[PDB]
Write a structure and sequence with these properties.
4 copies of one chain form a homotetramer. Chain A has helices spanning about 5-10, 20-30, 40, 55-65, 70-80, 80-90, 95-110, 115-130, 145-155, 165-170, 205-210, 240-255, 275-280, 290-295, 310-325, 340-345, 360-370, 385-390, 400-405; strands spanning about 135-140, 175-180, 190-200, 225-230, 260-265, 350-355, 370-375. Chain A is of the alpha+beta class and about 400 residues long. The first copy, chain A, folds into 2 domains: about 1-130, Malonyl-CoA decarboxylase, oligemerization domain (Butyryl-CoA Dehydrogenase, subunit A, domain 3, Up-down Bundle), CATH 1.20.140; about 130-405, Malonyl-CoA decarboxylase, catalytic domain (Aminopeptidase). Chain A has a 7-stranded mixed sheet. In chain A, helix 12 (about 240-255) links the parallel strand 4 and strand 5 (about 260-265). In chain A, helix 6 packs across helix 8. Chain A is globular. Chains in contact: A-B, A-C, B-D, C-D. Chains A and B meet through helix 4, helix 5, helix 8 and helix 12 of A and helix 4, helix 5, helix 8 and helix 12 of B. The complex binds chloride ion (8 copies) and nickel (II) ion (2 copies). Chains A, B, C, D: One of its GO terms (biological process) is fatty acid biosynthetic process.
């Protein structure tokens, strides 16, 4: 109620240098709310805290005959929603940034007017969280526990059991892990990656995870394996930077361990099984031999081990199907169907090889029938590959992958 | 030459996450330049890196009939100069922020098209250097020397001799000093203030500075005296925050030393002598008794000590003249004539008293014939005072000051 | 083999400033060993690296007629075992201190000649780990995990389950914990204590531990409860300092939370059941009514809950028996029978009250049939109490405890 | 007065864990004193706080027939002065170590009974300041100023003018400097060295110091030059470790700049002129041609420049005289006459070459008529050289030095 006239004052408080209290209070009265209040705030925010159309037209006015840089400025200014300043001003409150981030979070949960009140959140987050203001910190058994526990929490890909499991892939000098931290938040990371230093390229995530694995000297390691990336902040969805993390990490590895020559990933590739469902539909208009269709009716039974021959016959038609998925199949906007593909590829990586039944975990079995792939991050091939994809519609794939071309 | 097509690529390098090299190089090829190059860069920046008018009209187009929030967005977007992204993207270069700050500096040194290429620098600096991202650090004999030396350098008001002088007002627990630091720069402060903890309110800066002064127990101190504020970053001219520093400091003093009851300033007030020149001009249209005019002909002689009576007779007509200066005289835009007045007053302070011949230093003798004033920062009186001034045209002055009203 | 002539060189390497390598190597060749080697080292250490009796007699010689301070020096010197320098010199090896500490550990595991080679370890540890060189660090959910895990490991009294349990008594601002750290070791603490801030004095450890407990505002806390102290370093057995930790902690609590008025402990008191066994033996020569003896035959059945009346009748004769244990029963050297008693009492604490069935845990049930006591750390009463005990044979007990005097 | 019975209590306060207050007070009542009090403390310290001869004889008693390790212990114990514990116990006082160090300082300023009360100070300082507990910290323009200023203060060899001078040899990446710090003191270093990274070996300190010098890329540096070592703590006189500092530094340079191949020193060598005085005395019994004696009468005139021929003729007989000084001349205890020689040589360095008129400064002109030498720290030649000297009486000198053998 009053917590909606407060803001009005946050914008009027010119060179006061006191609004911090305003910002503060507004942020705490927000701390407490209900799904029917937190919603009536994100509305009257867009319903009243937008661009003052009066001054804007007055501007499009002057512009009709004044197309000189000074006008485009007055225009660009009037065009700015008032809820943008409000945010900047709200940022002054103690830890106000984090509070504003969790706020854009409660928004993203929930009309089309909101899509507008969000773009502003994004516009500010895209600068406040400019990668130039983020420091890459190494995460290991040493880093404080209250933040380490958040790692267990945010592990999206290969969910981390409990603390002994966490230690397992964080303690050995066999392993290593890095996260991005912003000075304001600082106790909670933005994104992180887990790496495995090894003497080869894994095919099964199981290899990399089993404690019964054999540890190798950190420096006797020839290749680095990014086996799991994770975004921790949800209210930063869109303000992407994992795209950096890799580029950075690979380089800091170069320095510290010049013995590393390869930089791969043991990625997941979900929404592949989803695809398969679309293909099995005769209405797919997708080519399938009555014999093929008759072999994929095997996926509908959650059993692969039984009759190794069973999986064997599945493998025979899955990989090429996948290769096909990857190398060609695009979405209606013409992009690689898989979400993590658009990632590694959008970062100039290369589809190195397919790993049939790499996971075997329940999630991946349902996400994409156990499949897993390795993406490669070659030194020179990166801006070139990023081009093949970007504007053309090409996917950087190795001959081993292309090979399965038609089968 | 090529260092002007590079940028063009910095904007095309979408989800590449490699432009850092672009940013870098562009920033170093900039490192080296000439006043005839550094100028041909700040031009072709505004001459080509502005808003693409084609898409902007296409937008004012759709807006003529679409006044729904989603349109104002597309408008506000098209209205944005391309040199804005360029900056954000340039920020990625190692220490890119500092490099971009020293850049806006080389701009400010130097047509009206530049006034437009600067507003953008400002728009980004006003968010990047949002006070929420600045930490108040205490500065004393402990803080590292490479940064301490910058303090000697940037002391604007009461210029600091050499290191022994610096130590003098930095070493005693009699003294204290705070600065604002931004995480990126971090080794060079943005603004700082020097404080003197005491048992009274000074009138002469000389009192506060002489080593022969008598030191008092830090906690036996009753009042805090801000005797000198200074902005270190020139390329941040306009992105004001000293206005905060005080508000903060006073509070951290409250905590650490609850014995402090007053919070004053031993300020300078320049451009007062400048004013006096304007008044002595008969064409001023300003009231002056032939007797007054005949007493101010004493200022033209750089000697005050000689014949204490001389200064005495000057004092008699200067203070009230000053009181007048302060309490009423406004500029053509209707604001307090003095620059540091617009500061302390714009921060809800109060003109407590005038100090005739407080300085005696060459700068202040020429800046405002040795005068100096004390501004007060009372607890409750601050948002009220800030209002008296803000929208009305009133100046918070104590009865002791008002007293000189008419004389 | 050669790893026993190396040392010989460590003592000959005067102003070489190179023996670090000697120290190093000797410490690594030690790293690897066997119970039949690590023992043949701790022998030839005392069997050859002791005081050179030749020079010592030559000294007791000169002393027979020279009793001037300069002689007592030459004497005190000759009297010094060579294995003392060896240790000092061994300390130079990288992390050599920690390595020498784990070494005194392998000694303590294992004739009477060793009791001599140990005193030297002690003489050096008592100075190297002089409390003046130890810093009290606060331990909580923030402190790094690799060290936090050691806390779970070394919890001697109320063994800590797993990480969720650890968090439980480390996370709330309801709780708090401090440890002593020496600069060399630094990643592993020496001793630590767990405290519970509350509004009363606990009787059952169960109260303090159950998560279902009710948390109170840290500052709304009236009393502090030391519920568990633990020494982490075994090779520092004897170089006692937990005796400090308390004295320190209580004081830092005073500062940070002036609301704390009491400082108690919910201590264990083991070897009490052990005592009881000694009393039930008719040969004890200890007074016991045929009726008493007939009620303590109830302890031999591991069931207390069953027939609350059972425990009730046990309680009736246990507390006074205990009060007796405490207030009078001394050992053959005339000291309080309980080991943790000699602790809190030797630190001028006061036996405040007895807690029948405070623990109920298997260890305490066997250690001292569930009993638990609260010791008090009153401000003035401490050096006085420490005297009552020290040289006299008195135990600081409250009237509530004394009360059970004879029953 | 009472401040001499306090200590008596510091020794009686067994497991009190409260004596810190005793230690404290005793240390402050000491803080204040007079040369006639501070002396009456260092006396009644040795006059009453020494070994209790009663128990000592009781020990030499048991030893007459008991020569088993357990006896030598009781002996070594009784032989220990009580003022030794007192110190250990005094160390508990806040910053008690530093306070005890400045104390041994006031002692060293001032009978032969004191020589005994000091050995104990030394015995404890030699362990407390065991090199294993000292960390080598790099000192440069970054390190805090309150400690940097102490560097200006303690520069013994080439006295450092003021802060601009200090900066001069501390700021360039041309230069570098390291100091040893003990955790307790920590704000004041123990010993430090100044190094110059270069492309050759200097002969004149003047080369290394002049700002007009030409700076070279830190890594384009081929050799490291230790041009000045300094001990800061006087109360640690005897607890030598500069002997380490070099050994350490050279190694950390190896790592950071593998381009460094040589490690020399541009040392001073005082008490050389002193020697010369001894030789010019006919009573020296030292060979001197009437022609020699007649050329050294030139030193008595403080002018070298005048008639370059003058210095030229001095040079001709000085270097060989020096070579002689160095290579042979020993003291009555048979050691190298120069004090800094006994240093670099005692650290296995090599006399590489002599620098006639290297200094020219007033101190060196009087210390040793401008002469200066370079000592070499070759990799393998160090423990060998340290042996040549140690037990034999040989000095590691290069053929260039030996060459001047007889002239
Ligand atoms: Cl904050
Ligand atoms: Cl980084
Ligand atoms: Cl950076
Ligand atoms: Cl702050
Ligand atoms: Cl170490
Ligand atoms: Cl402490
Ligand atoms: Cl301390
Ligand atoms: Cl070190
Ligand atoms: Ni913007
Ligand atoms: Ni000793």
């Amino acid at each position: 109620t009053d917590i909606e006239t407060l803001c009005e004052m946050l914008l009027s408080s010119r060179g006061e240098a006191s609004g911090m209290a305003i910002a503060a209070e507004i942020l705490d009265r927000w701390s407490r709310f209900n799904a029917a209040e937190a919603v009536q705030f994100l509305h009257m925010l867009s319903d009243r805290f937008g661009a003052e159309a009066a001054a804007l037209d007055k501007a499009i006015d002057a512009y009709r005959t004044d197309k000189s840089p000074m006008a485009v400025i007055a225009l660009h200014n009037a065009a700015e929603p008032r809820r943008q300043e409000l945010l900047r001003r709200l940022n002054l409150a103690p830890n106000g940034t984090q509070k504003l981030v969790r706020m854009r979070e409660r928004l993203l949960e929930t009309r089309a007017d909101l899509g507008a009140v969000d773009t502003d959140f994004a516009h500010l987050f895209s600068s406040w969280f400019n990668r130039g203001f983020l420091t890459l910190q190494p995460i290991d058994w040493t880093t404080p526990a209250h933040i380490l526990e958040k790692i267990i929490k945010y592990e999206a890909v290969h969910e981390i059991a409990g603390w002994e499991e966490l230690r397992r892939r964080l303690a050995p000098a066999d392993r290593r892990c890095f996260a991005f931290f912003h000075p304001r938040l600082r106790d909670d990371p933005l994104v992180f990656v887990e790496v495995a230093l090894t003497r080869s390229i894994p095919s099964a995530i199981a290899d990399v995870l089993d404690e019964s694995r054999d540890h190798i000297g950190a420096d006797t390691a020839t290749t680095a394996v990014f086996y799991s990336i994770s975004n921790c902040q949800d209210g930063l969805r869109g303000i992407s930077f994992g795209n950096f993390l890799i580029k950075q990490v690979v380089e800091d590895l170069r320095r510290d361990l010049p013995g590393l020559k390869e930089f791969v990933t043991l990625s997941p590739v979900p929404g592949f099984a989803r695809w398969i469902s679309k293909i099995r539909d005769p209405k797919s208009g997708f080519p399938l031999s009555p014999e093929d269709r008759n072999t994929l009716v095997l996926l509908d039974d959650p059993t692969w081990p039984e009759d190794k021959a069973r999986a064997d016959a599945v493998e025979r038609i899955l990989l090429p199907l996948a290769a096909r998925y990857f190398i060609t199949e695009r979405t209606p906007d013409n992009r690689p169907v898989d979400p993590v593909a658009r990632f590694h590829l959008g970062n100039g990586a290369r589809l190195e090889r397919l790993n049939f039944l790499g996971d075997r975990s329940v999630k991946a079995m349902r996400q994409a029938h156990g499949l897993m792939v390795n993406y490669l991050y070659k030194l020179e091939d990166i801006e070139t590959n990023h081009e093949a994809l970007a504007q053309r519609g090409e996917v950087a794939a190795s001959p081993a992958v292309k090979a399965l071309q038609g089968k």
